[PDB]
């Protein structure tokens, strides 16, 4: 391979694949913080060009943490379809980009091709895509999964109901649920992050969620987003199982930061198959986001976009119902402003869809990042056109408890009616039964949680 190009008379030399991958990224504050970013715009473009000339073989055979040192690398490498790989191994990344974007490349073509990819190759393609490339490329790569709802059918748009409370107060949790359903939010999942990682508390939160589900016969899922260890215990001791959640990271060291073994995720799949109230075949739920491996000291000199791609390579192994990035969840240290948070969201979603997982996005920001609610609304709509599987819903997007701002209940209804998208067909049926939705639109008596009373 060439680690070298000349641009405007000047030779641009790079040390390894890892450096080429890092410096080809669009400018973000985390890559500068990691020490891995390009020195200038010219070196950024030079890295992009060097990357685009490298083959699928070049980047498959150079993962950012080595096979023998890292269980996530082993996971990703072992999962490769080798005859799919052998077809594409001598493609340049430039050729792989144009293949993905081509109107003559079908969903069924990409279905087989993506099996010959690793996460680092997925990242490499994202690095040489413009914003419209990411959006159009993701749109022509639908990923469809089923729990009690079907998610990710083209022409549909789903939403997590996120009814969080500072005390896990069950009236406050219920009030936000009734509010969310009145806007048509919750077909992805009704999912609480709990204050206490504790079996009695988890069961109470789940009893509250499924109280509303059972009363009104809602086709959907419950989740409580504690550590996967305590979820499993709660469900084993007889709390209602819907989706089982874990935050994941793209290295073994990163998983150790989170207290996660691979065997816990095998166990969650096994517990789900025994216990969980799920009609379809997908019951797992992961969350991701750029900067988490950096924060862990677990990026090993790799940029945050390549590390985030390795999340999706990890996630794909377990065939989850839903994955989302939480795009600006941490703060300005890893993604500083609107421009960087938008770019990351489009990257993350594209890479998720290319890896073949059911990719949504928490379009979000923090109050110490240079960002406001207009950014959430820019990003949610751009991602919706990209066929993003789902966003979050909270009352005006205010988390009283996780201390950040996501998208409103309003915003899901807005996206759906702007873009002529429906909910999950099962959940849409339910919304029509309740008189909340007609022909994809909120009816007159929608947006009112008094309706359930």
């Amino acid at each position: 391979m060439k680690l070298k190009t000349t641009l405007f008379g000047n030779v641009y030399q790079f040390k390894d694949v890892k450096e080429v991958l890092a410096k080809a990224n669009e400018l973000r504050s985390g890559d500068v913080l990691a020490g891995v970013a390009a020195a200038s715009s010219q070196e950024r473009v030079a890295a992009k060009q060097v990357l685009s000339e490298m083959t699928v073989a070049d980047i498959r055979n150079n993962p950012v943490i080595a096979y023998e040192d890292d269980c996530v690398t082993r996971l990703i490498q072992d999962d490769v379809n080798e005859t799919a790989y052998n077809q594409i191994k001598n493609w340049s990344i430039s050729e792989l980009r144009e293949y993905v974007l081509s109107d003559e490349t079908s969903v069924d073509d990409i279905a087989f091709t993506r099996k010959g990819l690793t996460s680092e190759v997925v990242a490499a393609v994202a690095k040489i895509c413009s914003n419209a490339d990411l959006i159009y490329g993701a749109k022509k790569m639908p990923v469809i999964k089923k729990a009690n709802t079907t998610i990710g059918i083209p022409g549909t748009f789903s939403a997590r109901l996120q009814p969080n409370d500072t005390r896990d107060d069950v009236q406050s949790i219920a009030a936000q649920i009734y509010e969310g359903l009145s806007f048509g939010v919750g077909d992805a999942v009704i999912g609480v992050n709990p204050v206490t990682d504790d079996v009695e508390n988890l069961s109470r939160v789940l009893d509250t969620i499924y109280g509303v589900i059972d009363k009104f016969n809602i086709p959907t899922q419950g989740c409580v987003l504690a550590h996967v260890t305590t979820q499993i215990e709660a469900i084993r001791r007889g709390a209602p199982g819907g989706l089982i959640f874990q935050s994941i990271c793209g290295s073994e060291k990163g998983l150790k930061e989170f207290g996660v073994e691979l065997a816990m995720l095998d166990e969650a799949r096994a517990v789900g198959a025994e216990f969980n109230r799920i009609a379809g075949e997908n019951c797992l739920y992961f969350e991701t986001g750029q900067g988490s491996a950096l924060s862990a000291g677990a990026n090993f000199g790799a940029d945050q976009v390549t590390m985030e791609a390795r999340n999706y390579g990890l996630a794909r192994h377990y065939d989850p119902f839903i994955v989302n990035t939480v795009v600006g969840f941490i703060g300005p240290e890893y993604l500083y402003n609107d421009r960087q948070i938008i770019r990351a969201g489009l990257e993350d979603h594209f890479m998720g869809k290319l890896s073949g997982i059911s990719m949504g996005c928490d379009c979000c920001y923090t109050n110490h990042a240079d960002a406001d609610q207009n950014l959430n609304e820019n990003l949610m709509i751009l991602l919706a056109t990209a066929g993003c599987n789902y966003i979050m819903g909270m009352p005006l997007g205010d988390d009283i408890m996780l201390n950040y701002q996501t998208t409103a209940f309003h915003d899901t209804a807005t996206v759906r009616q702007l873009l002529n998208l429906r909910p999950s067909p099962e959940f849409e049926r339910w919304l029509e039964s309740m008189g909340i939705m007609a022909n994809g639109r909120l009816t007159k008596r929608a947006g009112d949680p008094s309706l359930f009373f």
Partner: protein, 252 residues
């Protein structure tokens, strides 16, 4: 006329033809999440957007604001620094917020008791209000809780510009068995008082991971009350020293 910061503006129900407006009032009362504001089409109502925008203007002020060195001296605290000089650098460099500065190691060795059973550290973190509002209410009943009935208590000190991983360096230098850090988590939209406790048994800088910590979060008047949070941290420290167990390594 209406102040967007007022309790009347916060209580406002915006749903325009309610099915049951008595339920609507019971639902607004039961949560501090921004429910029952209604809609214009699928968009938020104007007052709901205006009060959102007002709360964001003020939430943006709470992140960058700093407690005076005078207040820390008036608490009777040692003030000590991380490697970060100022608030601008703190926001972009978490790696330097996880390290004590050169004079910081020496001040701690000079002026702190050696080999505590429990070590209580305070940082402003990402919210000054989280420690400023809560301090006098959490710190006395915690300090009493640990020594008075119990064991050897290290001298309390304040870290300016601290991140959570700095308590691994603190626990090594002081030789501490348990390090309790009370720190300001990032400010919410309508809220900046939120304090968390990060506690780790016997930390080691190039060994301990984040899962080795126990978190108790959302300590404030609209959460777990700062008085009874002090009791639950003392009890956690008692259990920690008993089973010598860190975070996920703890039982039950």
């Amino acid at each position: 006329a209406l102040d967007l910061g007022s309790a009347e503006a916060k209580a406002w129900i915006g749903v325009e033809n309610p099915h049951r407006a008595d339920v609507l009032t019971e639902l607004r009362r039961s949560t501090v999440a921004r429910v029952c504001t209604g809609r214009a089409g699928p968009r938020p109502r104007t007052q709901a957007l205006l009060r959102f925008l007002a709360d964001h203007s003020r939430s943006k002020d709470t992140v960058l604001k700093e407690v005076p060195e005078e207040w820390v001296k008036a608490q009777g605290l040692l003030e000590v620094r991380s490697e970060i000089s100022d608030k601008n650098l703190y926001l972009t460099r978490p790696d330097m917020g996880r390290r004590l500065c050169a004079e910081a190691v020496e001040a701690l060795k000079a002026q702190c008791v050696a080999n505590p059973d429990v070590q209580v550290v305070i940082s402003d973190g990402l919210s000054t209000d989280a420690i400023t509002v809560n301090y006098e209410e959490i710190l006395p009943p915690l300090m009493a809780g640990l020594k008075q009935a119990g064991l050897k208590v290290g001298t309390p000190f304040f870290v300016r510009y601290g991140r959570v991983k700095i308590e691994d360096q603190i626990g090594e230098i002081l030789g501490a068995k348990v390090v309790i850090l009370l720190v300001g988590e990032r400010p919410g939209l309508g809220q900046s008082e939120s304090l968390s406790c990060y506690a780790v048994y016997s930390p080691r800088m190039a060994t301990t991971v984040e899962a080795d910590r126990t978190c108790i979060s959302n300590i404030h008047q609209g959460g777990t009350p700062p008085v009874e949070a002090a009791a639950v941290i003392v009890d956690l420290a008692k259990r920690m020293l008993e089973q010598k167990a860190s975070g996920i390594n703890m039982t039950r």
